[PDB]
Design a protein around this ligand. Structure first.
Ligand SMILES: NC(=O)c1ccc[n+]([C@@H]2O[C@H](COP(=O)([O-])OP(=O)(O)OC[C@H]3O[C@@H](n4cnc5c(N)ncnc54)[C@H](O)[C@@H]3O)[C@@H](O)[C@H]2O)c1
Ligand SMILES: NC(=O)c1ccc[n+]([C@@H]2O[C@H](COP(=O)([O-])OP(=O)(O)OC[C@H]3O[C@@H](n4cnc5c(N)ncnc54)[C@H](O)[C@@H]3O)[C@@H](O)[C@H]2O)c1
Ligand SMILES: Nc1ncnc2c1ncn2[C@@H]1O[C@H](CO)[C@@H](O)[C@H]1O
Ligand SMILES: Nc1ncnc2c1ncn2[C@@H]1O[C@H](CO)[C@@H](O)[C@H]1O
Lengths: 427, 427
């Protein structure tokens, strides 16, 4: 029993949804077709810390199909889909993950990925948020020597990598997967455009139309969140500290405001900043009865949930809580301030996760084979691989590329087969 | 009479609209307030080749207010606003520009900016499309030695600069103004979102709702063009050679198609590719009666207009022509295949042009003062100046920035005053 999941009998349900998801994830299935015979990951031993969803199940089985051995944990206490974890466990793949972990169980799960029977230890890390990278660096420095590198999924995780590199604390090569174009501009944006609304609806069933919704942060995540609620008839407000992002939001028709000014006016608050206490106690005290607060950024401290411990909490249903102020006023807190799309729904849909996870597999292949040519710094995959990820997803959604003629390729200074853009291109 | 314009008596009308535009261009007016006393451009002699519009008039007078002497020409034969040129000429500023220049008049106008009375010669170039840069390099190499650098406005122009640098043909420093974030992601995108529709309507008065419109190219320009027509109820098709840009368009709900497939289906065709003959004779032969074709990319060869010389052309009104095929079928060609927003309307509105032109002024200041620390390569302005451009435009449209606290700045690794993003950030 080299696994730990909530209920193993959910395996067959997990398997059925994984079968569906495979048809939504052509990038991963294309990598299996291209590489399953050559097994480029034979000899790879991957410790993974990434939301144990149906989509991640397809990622795991792609790594295994390419020859890898893996041990897996989720990177959020609420993000596991128990039936996905059970389907993976039933294949004999070590997974330590369930929805609703305590803090202690969470770190125990991560630790289980770092050693396996017969002296199994990872030579690769696959991380989403930097927790696994931190544990290894801080608590298992002997394991560091054997680790060829880490590939990192999300914006907050890559920020932690850059802080480490700035102070000489990064001891392994790192591939920034977030800043592949086919990740940051798809997952972060179009993923949240669908899964923010999903989390809100499943949790509260709230009408979006006519509501005043505030998005704190207008980066890739906040951009998608704004589109989502705007499409359903909300008046969308945006807060930003970056004047360029603020000008973008203003040019899309959003009023750019501070929560200091508008706290009494909002029905729904979404933190998308990757920052600390952007929603304070005073903000929440000023909010109307039954205001809905959630966080779609990576950590639980975008909202100061600590400041709410002084009040009575009344649970409505799992991951949906009332906080009752002394005058009787209530606010609704989603997922105890943690990732609302994964905590209250199922995260992003399979199709866009295929783009993110095709980048992950390519990074693991590149680290496994060529980590010796990398320094202890953070890199991105080259554009030719970024474009390949895009190409592998066009067929599913019926998009037909125009082929450049010789003179057209020459005219704009590109090879007919790409890359089509200079490295400084922002899309 | 050190100028050449269509009708000098239009000056007072030009002056009235320039006065209005100043209130729409807070970035330029802010630079005047900050720098008009210190005159950082005293001693600067700027030859400019850039659409002689009301907006460019505000740019010119900002350069002059900062101490510069300029000589100006337009970079398109149809893009001049005659009343803007007349207002500039009436100030005593040398301008050589009118709407409807012949090819010979066009290059004569450019040449006039390269020498003035009393042995006046430029020490700076301000270019939009690379024509002035080409003329100097190819036909005035003695003038090159005195030129401190060029600042270049648009995507096609910077591509020409990179081709030059790749072959050792660039002999002066160049600042890529297009790829300031506050240019490429605002001018190219939101500018075209309004001025493409403007050009189409003024030229043809065509209903957009219910039409099938094809956008060739889904870069910054094509992205804005698509939004424009989609907002007015067109079915918008997109063609792309770049799989990443294609996937973006598909994820916004556009069918990504080839003109080879859909020629019989389109009512309106817009080339936004910066490429050569993306619309061919056979495409146009297959199009329905009264199909509308236009180009919003920088040069007249996105559509093969040459292939239409074999047919009878019947003018409808200035810059709006019928091409009559042998079977009686007609197509409508806008502006002889040249920039439709500037040829058939007035280009982008003042507010977004203020963002582009605030970057231009900063680049000219940086070249004038520090060109000796630059090599003969193409550079961009640093992010701190990019963010300053954004800041200077927030007040006009009522956007209020959130100020980071000390711990929030530290938490994401930035200075409270910026820059807020790493150089690889794509917005
Ligand atoms: N839930 C998901 O599925 C998912 C997906 C991708 C990323 N994320 C996470 O979401 C967060 C945001 O990611 P991103 O890619 O959008 O980052 P980003 O850097 O592109 O955008 C964050 C924005 O927040 C703004 N901001 C920071 N502090 C602020 C403050 N106090 N007030 C207002 N605005 C402020 C910044 O100016 C920036 O524009 C990260 O923590 C990332 O890991 C979650
Ligand atoms: N009219 C204006 O006011 C205005 C403003 C800005 C830029 N421009 C001009 O517009 C052009 C496009 O600028 P941009 O910033 O969008 O460039 P971009 O590079 O961002 O976008 C151009 C796109 O065209 C695509 N493409 C190239 N050849 C193609 C083909 N044969 N078929 C289909 N797609 C093809 C490329 O893949 C690319 O995505 C340039 O010439 C630029 O100078 C005009
Ligand atoms: N359904 C999902 N399965 C796995 N990871 C997901 C899912 N939805 C979002 N994520 C990831 O969560 C990360 C933030 O922790 C994002 O960068 C995104 O890739
Ligand atoms: N109204 C306008 N005045 C001046 N330049 C403009 C205007 N509209 C668009 N342009 C410029 O035309 C360039 C293409 O030649 C674009 O990069 C854009 O900056």
């Amino acid at each position: 029993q080299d696994y730990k999941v909530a209920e193993i009998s959910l395996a067959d349900w997990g398997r059925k949804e994984i079968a569906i998801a495979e048809t939504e994830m052509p990038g991963l299935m294309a990598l299996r077709e291209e590489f399953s015979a050559k097994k480029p990951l034979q000899g790879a031993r991957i410790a993974g810390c990434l939301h144990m969803t149906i989509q991640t199940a397809v990622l795991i089985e792609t790594l295994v199909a390419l020859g890898a051995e893996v041990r897996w944990s989720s990177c959020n206490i609420f993000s596991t889909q128990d039936h996905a974890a059970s389907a993976i466990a039933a294949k004999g793949i070590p997974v330590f993950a369930w929805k609703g972990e305590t803090e202690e169980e969470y770190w125990w799960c991560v630790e289980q990925t770092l050693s396996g029977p017969n002296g199994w230890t990872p030579n690769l890390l696959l991380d989403d948020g930097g927790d696994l990278t931190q544990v290894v660096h801080q608590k298992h420095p002997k394991l560091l020597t054997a680790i060829k590198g880490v590939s990192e999924e999300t914006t907050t995780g890559v920020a932690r990598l850059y802080e480490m590199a700035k102070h000489g604390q990064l001891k392994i090569p790192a591939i920034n997967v977030n800043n592949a174009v086919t990740k940051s501009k798809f997952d972060n944006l179009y993923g949240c455009r669908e899964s923010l609304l999903d989390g809100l609806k499943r949790a509260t069933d709230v009408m979006i139309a006519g509501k005043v919704a505030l998005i704190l942060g207008y980066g890739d995540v906040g951009k998608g969140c704004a589109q989502a609620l705007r499409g359903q008839g909300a008046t969308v407000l945006v807060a930003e500290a970056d004047p360029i992002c603020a000008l973008q939001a203003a040019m899309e028709g959003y009023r750019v405001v501070t929560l200091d000014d508008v706290a009494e006016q909002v029905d729904i608050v979404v933190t998308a900043a990757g920052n600390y206490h952007v929603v304070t106690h005073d903000h929440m005290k000023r909010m109307r009865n039954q205001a809905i607060l959630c966080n779609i950024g990576h950590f639980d401290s975008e909202i100061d949930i600590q400041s709410l411990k002084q009040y009575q909490w009344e649970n409505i249903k799992p991951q949906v809580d009332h906080v009752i102020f002394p005058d009787g006023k209530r606010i609704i807190i989603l997922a105890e301030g943690r990732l609302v799309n994964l905590g209250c729904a199922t995260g992003h849909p399979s199709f866009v996760m295929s783009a993110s996870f095709t980048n992950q597999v390519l990074a693991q292949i590149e680290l496994f084979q060529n980590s010796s040519q990398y320094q202890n710094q953070v890199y991105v995959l080259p554009k030719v691989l970024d474009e390949k990820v895009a190409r592998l997803h066009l067929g599913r959604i019926g998009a037909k590329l125009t082929q450049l003629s010789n003179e057209q390729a020459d005219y704009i200074g590109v090879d007919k087969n790409g890359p089509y853009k200079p490295d400084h291109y922002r899309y």
